[PDB]
Amino acid sequence: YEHTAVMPNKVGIPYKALVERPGYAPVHLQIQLVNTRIIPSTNLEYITCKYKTKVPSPVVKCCGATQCTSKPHPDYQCQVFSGVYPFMYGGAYCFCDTENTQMSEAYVERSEECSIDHAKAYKVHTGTVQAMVNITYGSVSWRSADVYVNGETPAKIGDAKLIIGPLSSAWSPFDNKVVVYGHEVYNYDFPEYGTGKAGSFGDLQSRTSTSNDLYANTNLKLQRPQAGIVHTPFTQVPSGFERWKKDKGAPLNDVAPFGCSIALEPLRAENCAVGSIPISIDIPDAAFTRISETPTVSDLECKITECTYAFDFGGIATVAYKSSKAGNCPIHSPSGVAVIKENDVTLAESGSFTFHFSTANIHPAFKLQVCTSAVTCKGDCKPPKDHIVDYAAQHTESFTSAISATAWSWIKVLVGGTSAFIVLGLIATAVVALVLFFHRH
Amino acid sequence: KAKCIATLAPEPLVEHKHRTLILHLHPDHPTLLTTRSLGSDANPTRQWIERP
Numbered sequence: 001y002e003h004t005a006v007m008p009n010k011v012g013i014p015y016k017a018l019v020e021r022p023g024y025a026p027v028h029l030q031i032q033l034v035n036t037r038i039i040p041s042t043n044l045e046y047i048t049c050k051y052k053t054k055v056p057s058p059v060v061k062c063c064g065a066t067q068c069t070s071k072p073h074p075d076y077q078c079q080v081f082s083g084v085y086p087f088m089y090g091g092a093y094c095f096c097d098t099e100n101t102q103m104s105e106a107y108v109e110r111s112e113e114c115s116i117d118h119a120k121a122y123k124v125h126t127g128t129v130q131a132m133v134n135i136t137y138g139s140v141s142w143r144s145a146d147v148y149v150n151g152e153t154p155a156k157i158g159d160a161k162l163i164i165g166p167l168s169s170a171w172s173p174f175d176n177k178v179v180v181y182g183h184e185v186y187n188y189d190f191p192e193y194g195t196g197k198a199g200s201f202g203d204l205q206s207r208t209s210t211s212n213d214l215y216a217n218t219n220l221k222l223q224r225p226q227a228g229i230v231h232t233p234f235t236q237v238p239s240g241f242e243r244w245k246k247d248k249g250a251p252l253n254d255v256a257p258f259g260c261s262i263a264l265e266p267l268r269a270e271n272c273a274v275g276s277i278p279i280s281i282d283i284p285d286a287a288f289t290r291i292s293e294t295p296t297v298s299d300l301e302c303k304i305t306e307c308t309y310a311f312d313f314g315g316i317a318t319v320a321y322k323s324s325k326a327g328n329c330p331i332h333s334p335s336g337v338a339v340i341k342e343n344d345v346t347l348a349e350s351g352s353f354t355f356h357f358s359t360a361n362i363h364p365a366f367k368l369q370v371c372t373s374a375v376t377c378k379g380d381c382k383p384p385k386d387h388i389v390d391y392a393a394q395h396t397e398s399f400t401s402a403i404s405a406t407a408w409s410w411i412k413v414l415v416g417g418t419s420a421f422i423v424l425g426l427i428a429t430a431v432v433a434l435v436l437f438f439h440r441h
Numbered sequence: 442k443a444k445c446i447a448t449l450a451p452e453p454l455v456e457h458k459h460r461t462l463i464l465h466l467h468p469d470h471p472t473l474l475t476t477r478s479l480g481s482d483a484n485p486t487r488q489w490i491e492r493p
């Protein structure tokens with residue numbers, strides 16, 4: 001027996017409903033999301049990290065000269081400095097005073113830290129949505145499984161075939177390009193591979209952390225050695241990866257809307273409370289007991305004894321009843337006015353039972369289903385005194401939830417008063433025309 | 442990769458008003474405070490607090 005509905009995209013707040021099959025006792029159904037995961041399709045573009053400048057031993061040619069040869073090294077530099085007269089611990093290195101030459105070389109390579117301290121540049125595309133759903137129904141205990149939130153793939157959870165529809169809003173916190181660093185994810189528009197600029201995030205780029213083909217773009221310039229000294233001085237733009245670390249700003253972990261959590265294995269946004277989720281669950285015939293074998297109730301009377309429209313279950317009500325074939329009975333509230341804490345009650349041949357509920361309404365009025373029967377509960381609720389709480393609201397707001405009977409009275413008096421005044425003017429207008437007509441005739 | 446011991450700032454004093462969260466922050470070191478709402482418009486806040 002298939003039951004179809006739409007449940008809010010909320011984690012930790014269950015969707016509760018009765019599966020009503022004429023001739024059989026209603027099966028109470030409860031579907032709770034354990035987590036919701038938005039898993040985009042990602043493609044690693046390149047890996048950037050802090051660079052290391054490799055400086056081989058310079059070639060010092062005494063009484064002669066050398067020429068630079070281009071080499072296949074990242075950001076390779078080579079310059080020949082003539083007219084050098086270097087000294088070592090053993091004295092002057094060269095004999096000639098001005099005919100000596102020093103060749104300096106330098107190139108960029110990944111630092112040792114790049115194996116543990118690097119940022120991954122990903123291109124992000126629309127992917128899939130998954131969730132873990134906790135389901136209980138009838139007398140069946142809680143069962144859970146990972147499902148695909150696409151409305152097409154059925155999940156079998158405890159002999160029930162669950163199809164969770166696509167999210168009503170195709171929203172994702174990830175932009176087209178993101179940077180993953182450590183546990184953090186950033187919506188950073190990084191330069192494409194091979195186009196990085198010195199001092200910026202992508203100055204050093206590698207397709208993989210173990211790739212042998214490295215791209216480097218720094219203003220690495222060889223400087224002339226100090227007089228009499230054998231060394232290879234140079235200037236270079238400070239690493240843009242270390243610069244980015246300072247200018248990262250807030251990560252997506254800390255700014256994502258809808259309370260999303262960002263996980264990395266795989267990269268995904270979790271528990272984003274966006275929109276609603278269509279659902280469809282097919283419950284086997286074994287779960288449905290014939291009405292003739294279950295209790296039924298009549299002459300129901302509901303009393304709300306206490307109520308606060310707090311986020312918690314601040315409402316309390318009592319239902320008087322008469323029944324036949326006394327036994328366990330499911331409880332449900334079809335409307336959104338109040339969320340019922342209880343799932344079922346134990347009935348006697350006669351008596352009453354109590355239940356707790358959460359409502360945002362000042363004057364809640366809602367239908368309570370009891371073994372295919374229904375009773376209307378009405379009462380007034382006081383406001384809570386606690387300004388801030390550490391838990392989410394169980395109930396749902398509406399336009400008219402906050403309008404009190406006194407406010408409705410003023411609205412009715414205002415609208416009725418103005419309408420009656422206009423009607424009075426129109427009746428007077430109609431009568432005077434009728435009187436004038438009789439003057440002529 | 443290794444595990445390092447980082448400091449813990451003193452727990453804030455929290456005062457509640459209608460739709461307002463009041464935090465009294467007394468850090469020992471420059472401490473980062475960030476906030477965001479859980480709605481469709483998460484207005485983020487990011488500030489380093491060095492003094493009470």
Ligand SMILES: *[C@@H]1O[C@H](CO)[C@@H](O)[C@H](O)[C@H]1NC(C)=O
Binds near residue numbers: 034142143
């Ligand atoms: C399902 O809900 C029950 C409630 O008692 C809980 O014990 C169980 O751990 C939940 N399942 C998951 C996967 O969280």
